[PDB]
Amino acid sequence: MRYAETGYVLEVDLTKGSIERVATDPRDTELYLGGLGTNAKILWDRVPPEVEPFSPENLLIFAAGLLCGTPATGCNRTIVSTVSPQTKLMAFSMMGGFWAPELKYAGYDKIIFRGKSPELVYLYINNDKVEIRDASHLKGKGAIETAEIIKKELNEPRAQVAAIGKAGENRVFYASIEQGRSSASRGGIGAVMGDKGLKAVVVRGTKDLCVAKPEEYIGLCNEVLDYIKHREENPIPDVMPILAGLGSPQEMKVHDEKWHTENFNWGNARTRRKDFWTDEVSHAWEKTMDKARTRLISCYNCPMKCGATISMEGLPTYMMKCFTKLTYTMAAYSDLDFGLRIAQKATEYGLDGFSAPQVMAFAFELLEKGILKDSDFPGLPEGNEERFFYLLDKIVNRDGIGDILANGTYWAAQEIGNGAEDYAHNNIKKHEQLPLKLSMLNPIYYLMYCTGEKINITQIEGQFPQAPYPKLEQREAFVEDWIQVPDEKFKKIFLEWEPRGEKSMPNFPTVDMCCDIVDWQEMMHYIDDALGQCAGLSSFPLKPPYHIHNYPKFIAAGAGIEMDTEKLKKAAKRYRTLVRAFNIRRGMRRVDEQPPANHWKNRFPELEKELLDSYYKLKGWNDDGIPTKETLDDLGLGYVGDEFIKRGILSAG
Amino acid sequence: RIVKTINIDADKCNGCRACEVICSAFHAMPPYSSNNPARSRVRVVRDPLRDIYVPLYAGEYTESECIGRDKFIIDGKEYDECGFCRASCPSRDLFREPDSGLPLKCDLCDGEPEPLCVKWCLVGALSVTEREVEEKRTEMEIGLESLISRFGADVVADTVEQ
Amino acid sequence: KRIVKTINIDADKCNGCRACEVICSAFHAMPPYSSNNPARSRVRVVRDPLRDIYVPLYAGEYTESECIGRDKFIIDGKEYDECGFCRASCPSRDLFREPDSGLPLKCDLCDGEPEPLCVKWCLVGALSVTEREVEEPDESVKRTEMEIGLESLISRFGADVVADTVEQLT
Ligand SMILES: CC(C)(COP(=O)(O)OP(=O)(O)OC[C@H]1O[C@@H](n2cnc3c(N)ncnc32)[C@H](O)[C@@H]1OP(=O)(O)O)[C@@H](O)C(=O)NCCC(=O)NCCSC(=O)c1ccccc1
Numbered sequence: 001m002r003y004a005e006t007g008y009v010l011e012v013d014l015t016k017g018s019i020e021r022v023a024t025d026p027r028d029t030e031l032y033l034g035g036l037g038t039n040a041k042i043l044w045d046r047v048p049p050e051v052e053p054f055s056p057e058n059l060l061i062f063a064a065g066l067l068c069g070t071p072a073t074g075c076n077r078t079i080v081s082t083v084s085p086q087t088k089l090m091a092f093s094m095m096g097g098f099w100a101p102e103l104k105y106a107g108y109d110k111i112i113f114r115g116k117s118p119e120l121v122y123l124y125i126n127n128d129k130v131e132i133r134d135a136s137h138l139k140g141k142g143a144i145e146t147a148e149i150i151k152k153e154l155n156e157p158r159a160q161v162a163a164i165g166k167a168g169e170n171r172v173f174y175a176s177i178e179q180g181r182s183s184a185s186r187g188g189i190g191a192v193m194g195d196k197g198l199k200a201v202v203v204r205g206t207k208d209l210c211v212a213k214p215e216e217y218i219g220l221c222n223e224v225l226d227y228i229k230h231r232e233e234n235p236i237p238d239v240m241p242i243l244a245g246l247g248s249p250q251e252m253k254v255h256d257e258k259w260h261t262e263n264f265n266w267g268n269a270r271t272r273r274k275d276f277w278t279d280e281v282s283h284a285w286e287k288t289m290d291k292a293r294t295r296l297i298s299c300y301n302c303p304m305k306c307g308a309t310i311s312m313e314g315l316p317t318y319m320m321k322c323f324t325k326l327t328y329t330m331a332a333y334s335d336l337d338f339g340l341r342i343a344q345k346a347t348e349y350g351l352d353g354f355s356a357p358q359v360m361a362f363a364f365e366l367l368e369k370g371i372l373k374d375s376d377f378p379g380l381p382e383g384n385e386e387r388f389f390y391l392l393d394k395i396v397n398r399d400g401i402g403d404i405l406a407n408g409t410y411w412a413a414q415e416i417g418n419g420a421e422d423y424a425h426n427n428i429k430k431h432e433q434l435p436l437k438l439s440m441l442n443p444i445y446y447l448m449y450c451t452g453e454k455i456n457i458t459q460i461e462g463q464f465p466q467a468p469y470p471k472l473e474q475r476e477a478f479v480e481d482w483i484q485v486p487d488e489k490f491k492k493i494f495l496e497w498e499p500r501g502e503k504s505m506p507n508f509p510t511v512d513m514c515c516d517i518v519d520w521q522e523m524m525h526y527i528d529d530a531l532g533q534c535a536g537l538s539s540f541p542l543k544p545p546y547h548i549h550n551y552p553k554f555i556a557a558g559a560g561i562e563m564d565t566e567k568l569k570k571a572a573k574r575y576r577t578l579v580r581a582f583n584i585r586r587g588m589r590r591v592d593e594q595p596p597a598n599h600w601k602n603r604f605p606e607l608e609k610e611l612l613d614s615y616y617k618l619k620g621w622n623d624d625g626i627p628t629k630e631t632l633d634d635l636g637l638g639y640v641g642d643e644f645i646k647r648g649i650l651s652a653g
Numbered sequence: 654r655i656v657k658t659i660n661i662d663a664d665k666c667n668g669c670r671a672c673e674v675i676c677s678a679f680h681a682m683p684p685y686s687s688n689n690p691a692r693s694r695v696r697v698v699r700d701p702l703r704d705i706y707v708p709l710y711a712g713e714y715t716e717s718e719c720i721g722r723d724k725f726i727i728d729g730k731e732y733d734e735c736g737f738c739r740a741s742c743p744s745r746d747l748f749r750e751p752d753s754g755l756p757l758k759c760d761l762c763d764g765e766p767e768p769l770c771v772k773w774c775l776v777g778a779l780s781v782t783e784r785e786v787e788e789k790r791t792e793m794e795i796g797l798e799s800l801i802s803r804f805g806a807d808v809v810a811d812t813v814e815q
Numbered sequence: 816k817r818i819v820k821t822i823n824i825d826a827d828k829c830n831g832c833r834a835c836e837v838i839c840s841a842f843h844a845m846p847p848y849s850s851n852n853p854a855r856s857r858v859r860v861v862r863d864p865l866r867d868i869y870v871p872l873y874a875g876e877y878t879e880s881e882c883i884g885r886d887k888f889i890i891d892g893k894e895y896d897e898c899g900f901c902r903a904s905c906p907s908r909d910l911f912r913e914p915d916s917g918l919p920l921k922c923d924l925c926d927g928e929p930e931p932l933c934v935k936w937c938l939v940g941a942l943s944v945t946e947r948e949v950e951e952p953d954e955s956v957k958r959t960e961m962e963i964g965l966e967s968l969i970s971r972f973g974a975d976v977v978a979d980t981v982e983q984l985t
């Protein structure tokens with residue numbers, strides 16, 4: 001029998017209203033583990049490149065990680081996968097909370113949606129009971145608001161609900177899916193969900209979930225908890241607060257945001273304010289945050305409590321975590337009070353807290369320059385704050401100028417013209433990046449910006465420190481108990497690495513060292529997004545409780561399959577290449593893999609070419625970014641190599 | 654005799670529901686072979702929007718519902734109907750096996766070194782403590798006379814013989 | 816469909832007068848109103864003025880055994896009593912038990928009477944009872960107050976002892 005996984009999925013046709021439970025192939029588990037990996041397998045051989053994002057044949061997959069529903073601490077992530085309406089590439093999005101584990105308790109590993117529903121509806125799951133309900137009375141309702149009404153309707157107080165806001169219903173290219181204190185935020189997956197007339201997905205589960213090696217599996221679980229205690233008694237020395245400990249960026253706990261407000265760019269990723277964090281500002285923001293934060297809450301089976309309930313006066317309560325705390329504030333040149341109030345509106349609407357702020361600031365720059373006229377913004381209010389609330393409503397409704405801005409900075413500038421493309425200066429593969437315009441070229445981050453399939457920098461980094469220690473004693477101390485490294489050489493790299501001089505960036509670490517680092521950091525994220533493990537306890541923070549050495553044990557004891565360190569490394573490489581192959585088939589080439597032209601002020605073309613060339617070699621790809629026939633056959637992806645040749649993507653010989 | 658008190662600091666709870674995970678896991682057969690929050694002897698009443706997080710422990714069995722159910726408003730918070738009842742009651746699913754309906758009851762992890770729910774609550778909202786307490790037939794007679802006065806001696810006599 | 820009744824308790828409006836204890840004990844005296852005694856009231860007020868705790872607790876379900884562990888809450892800065900929200904007629908405490916016999920007490924909403932008296936006497940309007948229909952069937956094993964009272968004695972003292980005593984009173 002199957003373990004960790006349930007071995008079953010739901011196939012839903014929203015056009016015919018048909019529902020079907022189908023057993024999964026156990027071979028898929030051995031090759032692609034689960035979550036993102038198996039999502040990639042499904043999308044590959046069911047979604048050909050001729051399928052458009054808002055086409056009925058486009059798929060919307062809700063996947064619970066392999067180890068979700070087990071006692072594994074923090075393992076609770078949902079992986080939503082589809083074809084992005086913004087980037088035209090694959091879009092996988094992660095969501096925390098309690099939804100994924102509930103699905104497992106219901107008896108399912110995934111839910112795959114195809115076609116479209118003519119009427120607004122939501123899916124109701126209660127163990128073996130599955131049905132489609134009408135949701136017309138929920139039209140326009142906010143994401144969180146929607147969940148509460150449903151749980152009253154069905155009389156299921158303990159059901160978990162993933163819903164879309166008005167933004168998703170109106171197919172905003174950066175619309176999200178909201179569930180309590182969790183969000184599948186990026187990729188426009190909310191736009192696809194709305195396009196299919198799917199207002200929400202409600203699931204309740206009370207079945208058992210089994211593991212293969214009970215005693216052994218709980219042993220590793222306790223080993224993690226013990227490490228979390230010890231780790232939280234020994235934060236990383238001389239790092240900032242929101243990087244010393246475990247979990248997601250603890251921005252709800254720490255009031256200090258000097259690193260953020262003085263190193264990140266305000267507005268349309270435009271302005272840098274070196275001396276913003278004054279005493280008056282630090283006190284005003286701490287007061288606002290103490291009054292707004294009700295409680296620090298956690299995800300399922302996790303003690304880190306990264307999120308927080310936010311209560312602004314005269315506004316409904318919503319939940320928040322990580323960097324969305326500042327994006328609306330910094331993009332509007334305002335304060336933390338404004339940011340918390342508009343984030344409430346945006347979370348209910350279901351918008352990406354990264355792109356949305358940059359799109360609105362992008363619009364005001366165009367209005368400032370004169371590329372957009374005041375006639376495009378009728379009835380526009382006077383205040384800077386009021387203008388953001390104004391433009392926010394225009395976007396979610398796709399009203400007038402809001403209809404164009406609802407497509408993202410790339411497509412909006414494309415349609416606007418008149419030099420609007422010049423102000424879309426912060427995109428990679430048509431996707432907005434973090435507002436960061438640093439001075440000196442970073443050889444490690446350059447690679448992560450160019451090749452990251454998520455196209456987000458915060459979701460590929462983690463395991464290697466972002467900066468070197470000034471003193472050698474500090475490095476020797478760090479590498480002392482750095483048991484998470486796959487190889488001793490990662491310790492030796494950090495020892496030699498210095499902030500200034502003959503061993504500083506961009507010329508050090510070397511090109512070969514940078515490639516190895518990027519490959520390790522990326523590998524841990526892909527393992528996380530297949531197992532369902534929150535990165536906060538794994539691939540994100542320094543020296544995590546989960547790593548390349550005990551992960552194989554969790555899989556073996558949990559799922560009952562043969563798994564070791566090397567076999568796991570190869571697995572992660574397998575469906576990370578498959579994801580790559582999916583984007584190749586959709587027209588992605590080396591040309592698309594370049595950072596923004598103004599991302600760094602000091603550029604080194606010859607070093608950057610050597611970096612991307614060497615990294616491709618390590619991955620086993622072409623000098624155009626395409627996985628060769630040799631590496632594909634070696635990975636067990638022969639069917640990919642055949643289709644590449646047949647499609648002319650790869651040449652025979 | 655010794656009474657054990659489960660100390661629950663609702664202000665410290667974050668709603669991770671880890672307690673439910675480990676409790677049900679241990680009580681699986683064999684132990685840890687599976688888990689299921691519905692089979693947990695501790696259940697967290699959770700509403701983030703109301704700022705309610707209240708760990709509840711499985712208490713006593715009852716074969717009938719109350720004629721009236723209680724529903725509190727305390728310090729601004731509107732709690733659920735029967736929001737604090739530990740009973741395995743026929744009125745809901747709490748503290749009852751999800752497949753058979755049989756009653757569940759916390760036994761403080763009898764036999765084990767420490768309550769697992771307490772052990773996996775790394776934020777320390779839960780603790781169990783002990784203390785000694787001090788342990789006639791005139792009460793019986795008075796009660797019977799009370800029963801005879803309220804229902805009648807003829808009614809009381811016939812009921813006892815059954 | 817059946818009807819379930821809910822006792823609505825606004826502890827933020829309570830003043831700790833305990834007028835509810837007076838009337839319930841009064842009405843349930845034999846004969847009615849002949850005397851009163853808060854200790855036999857089926858509504859009992861949790862009251863610590865210094866802690867600002869005012870909580871009306873209605874007598875609930877009978878249980879012949881105590882739990883293996885008692886709970887004790889700290890909620891919103893207030894340290895409530897051990898078992899402070901339990902409605903049970905339990906052998907661990909005197910709440911909801913006759914002070915002289917040990918018999919179980921239970922609120923029947925003044926069954927037979929025009930309206931719940933405690934609610935009638937609570938002029939500040941902290942109490943109220945409302946009704947609603949539900950679809951779930953009543954699987955309660957309905958035992959009479961007479962039957963539950965006798966059984967509690969039989970468990971405490973024995974069937975043979977209780978029987979002989981009954982035949983020595985009638
Ligand atoms: C300190 C760094 C490492 C870089 O910041 P800085 O120190 O400012 O580095 P700069 O590049 O600005 O140059 C500084 C100055 O020194 C100069 N200079 C430089 N090198 C050299 C040299 N070798 N030799 C000599 N000089 C050198 C350089 O010319 C410049 O001087 P000028 O003014 O031009 O004259 C850090 O802040 C960082 O974030 N980096 C990681 C990458 C990253 O973005 N990761 C975060 C991802 S988001 C995230 O994780 C997250 C988001 C939300 C929520 C949660 C999480």
Ligand SMILES: Nc1nc2c(c(=O)[nH]1)N[C@H]1C(S)=C(S)[C@@H](COP(=O)(O)O)O[C@H]1N2
Binds near residue numbers: 095182322323529533
């Ligand atoms: N497996 C996995 N876990 C992850 C992440 C991820 O990308 N993959 N993102 C992390 C970051 S940076 C944040 S801010 C939170 C966001 O949680 P949410 O998606 O539930 O809102 O998830 C964290 N956990």
Ligand SMILES: Nc1nc2c(c(=O)[nH]1)N[C@H]1C(S)=C(S)[C@@H](COP(=O)(O)O)O[C@H]1N2
Binds near residue numbers: 094176323458
């Ligand atoms: N509406 C909304 N957008 C959001 C967030 C959020 O919490 N809410 N999280 C931000 C952060 S900090 C991260 S790391 C990503 C989460 O990535 P994902 O949800 O697409 O997997 O979304 C960003 N956009």
Ligand code: SF4
Binds near residue numbers: 248297
């Ligand atoms: S570390 Fe934070 S984001 Fe991750 S599971 Fe725990 S509470 Fe959730």
Ligand code: SF4
Binds near residue numbers: 668
């Ligand atoms: S493990 Fe602790 S903090 Fe988490 S829900 Fe249980 S009692 Fe609350």
Ligand code: SF4
Binds near residue numbers: 715723739742875876
């Ligand atoms: S759950 Fe408790 S309070 Fe509610 S009807 Fe049952 S015994 Fe009475």
Ligand code: SF4
Binds near residue numbers: 675768769
């Ligand atoms: S004390 Fe033991 S039996 Fe009771 S809820 Fe906790 S784990 Fe379960």
Ligand code: SF4
Binds near residue numbers: 830832833860939
């Ligand atoms: S009469 Fe009302 S206010 Fe007074 S003690 Fe009773 S419930 Fe409280």
Ligand code: SF4
Binds near residue numbers: 878880901902907
């Ligand atoms: S008073 Fe209630 S909670 Fe306390 S031991 Fe008795 S039945 Fe259990």
Ligand code: SF4
Binds near residue numbers: 858932
């Ligand atoms: S409703 Fe009637 S029987 Fe029940 S506690 Fe109030 S006065 Fe007493």
Ligand SMILES: [Mg+2]
Binds near residue numbers: 096182185
């Ligand atoms: Mg997310």
Ligand SMILES: [W+6]
Binds near residue numbers: 248249
């Ligand atoms: W983040």
